[PDB]
């Protein structure tokens, strides 16, 4: 089998206009292979499409990493009289994550085609694309791209000439990270506070407007047409087994050339940073820690970063997760406690407030972490903060509560001596 991963080739890159160097409107999208044989894909039936997605091994690119073909197949069932919908999650709110932004504005027709192909698989009559309200220009690009498809017969009535009616609506958010959560997104579309729903019922049973719904990430849906064209096996030939395909990576923070890039799954973390980002600032030896999958994932220290791979299973073993694959790099000049304290401050401002452990607990964690930054605490409080985070984790309605706890646990797990040192400095100064 393949034993090393990375060094992906342009011939095998899905998002070929990632950098906006080519025309983003329909004429460019067609010349690059979009909307080609879309009718054939639609006339092959949902069961064929879901099988292609099932065999590709695609896993959700929104953060949870749930296998996609299995998830989409929950909609594969007879209608009971309600309409069926595909909600596309373009909220892109996780700090460090900006991959969906490039897809929306530079490759909008891949998303629009993905909506139709995935919508056909689920039997949906329309797709609502929920895009965060701060992406006004990207949302206008998407509506322009959607208008071209409607004018080409590629969507709407008799889409592509397949006898299938599909609408693509774009609805904008109004400023809330919690509206990236699948059920909180649905409540936002319905015109409520973006507060998540409890499960059950699952969205495939009772979703937007109370109807069967599937929420899919923009990247998850944007690659779907290509997997159907080139086949699931082609996509599954990349990355480790169960970690298939090509992934978008955002390398930010203390790198020489922060960038977004498409790279094969299971690429080493070290290679990814050096190859595309130009390496850590001040040399690889100047690395302190990396947040590998967005703010919700725990950080890892330089020692783990040496050999860890970038895929779901590799990063779980390092006591973290792939998340959105947003790589935030911190060099040794970083005040690590301050950096993690700022993320807990972020979750504090983003918690919807609905449920007790996050409404009260995250704010409590923020107040403690602020004192840790200054050392105005006692070493016994470190174990108390670990216990508090475990009272939030797994007890909240939605996974924002877990995402607030994990960064705190990562800091305590790998940088406890730093925390104690700061308390030592504060105590001896006021002594």
């Amino acid at each position: 089998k393949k034993t090393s991963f990375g060094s992906l080739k342009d011939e095998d890159r899905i998002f070929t206009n990632l950098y906006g160097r080519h025309d983003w409107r329909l004429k460019g999208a067609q010349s690059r292979g979009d909307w080609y044989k879309t009718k054939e894909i639609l006339l092959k039936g949902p069961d064929w499409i879901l099988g292609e997605v099932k065999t590709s091994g695609l896993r959700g690119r929104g953060g949870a990493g749930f296998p996609t073909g299995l998830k989409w197949s929950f909609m594969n069932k007879p209608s009971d009289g309600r309409p069926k919908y595909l909600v596309v999650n373009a909220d892109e709110g996780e700090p460090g994550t900006c991959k969906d932004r490039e897809i929306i504005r530079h490759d909008p027709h891949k998303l629009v085609e993905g909506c139709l192909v995935g919508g056909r698989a689920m039997g949906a009559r329309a797709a609502y694309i929920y895009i965060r309200g701060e992406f006004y220009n990207e949302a206008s690009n998407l509506q322009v791209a959607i208008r071209e498809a409607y004018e080409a017969g590629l969507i709407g009535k008799n889409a592509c000439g397949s006898g299938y009616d599909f609408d693509v609506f774009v609805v904008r958010g109004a400023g809330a990270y919690i509206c990236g959560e699948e059920t909180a997104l649905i409540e936002s579309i319905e015109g409520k506070q973006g507060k998540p729903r409890l499960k059950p019922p699952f969205p495939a049973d009772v979703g937007v407007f109370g109807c069967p719904t599937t929420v899919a990430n923009v990247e998850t849906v944007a690659v779907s047409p290509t997997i159907c064209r080139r086949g699931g096996a082609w996509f599954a030939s990349f990355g480790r087994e169960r970690n298939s395909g090509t992934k978008l990576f955002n390398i930010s923070g203390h790198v020489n050339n922060p960038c977004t890039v498409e790279e094969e799954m299971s690429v080493p973390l070290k290679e990814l940073i050096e190859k595309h980002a130009g390496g850590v600032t001040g040399g690889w030896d100047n690395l302190l820690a990396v947040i590998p999958g967005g703010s919700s994932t725990p950080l890892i220290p330089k020692s783990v970063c040496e050999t860890v791979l970038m895929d779901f299973d590799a990063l779980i073993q390092a006591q973290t997760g792939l998340g959105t694959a947003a790589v935030i790099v911190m060099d040794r000049s970083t005040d690590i406690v301050k950096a993690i304290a700022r993320l807990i401050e972020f979750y504090k401002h983003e918690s919807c407030g609905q449920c007790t452990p996050c409404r009260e607990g995250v704010d409590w964690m923020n107040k403690v972490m602020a004192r840790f930054v200054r050392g105005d605490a006692r070493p016994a409080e470190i174990d108390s903060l670990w216990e508090i985070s475990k009272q939030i984790e797994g007890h909240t309605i939605c996974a924002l509560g877990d995402g607030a706890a994990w960064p705190v646990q990562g800091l305590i797990r790998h940088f406890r001596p730093e925390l104690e040192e700061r308390m030592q400095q504060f105590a001896q100064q006021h002594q």
Partner: protein, 87 residues
Amino acid sequence: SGVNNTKKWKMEFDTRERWENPLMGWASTADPLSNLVLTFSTKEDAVAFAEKNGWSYDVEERKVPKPKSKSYGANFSWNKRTRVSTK
């Protein structure tokens, strides 16, 4: 919301005059049974105790909350009135 005080049967007696004490305004009574409350496992136990002691009595049948049909899903109904406008 706790229901732990609705488990057992109680026997109490009819309320009688309380009046204000002239010196202090305290609540005076001449009813020796004003505070007497007995606890019984079952209605039959309470009735039997009342009969042998010669007290006339009224028995009120136990009130049990109706069993309700709860469903979180109904809050988001496609076409029913149970759809909630807020959470």
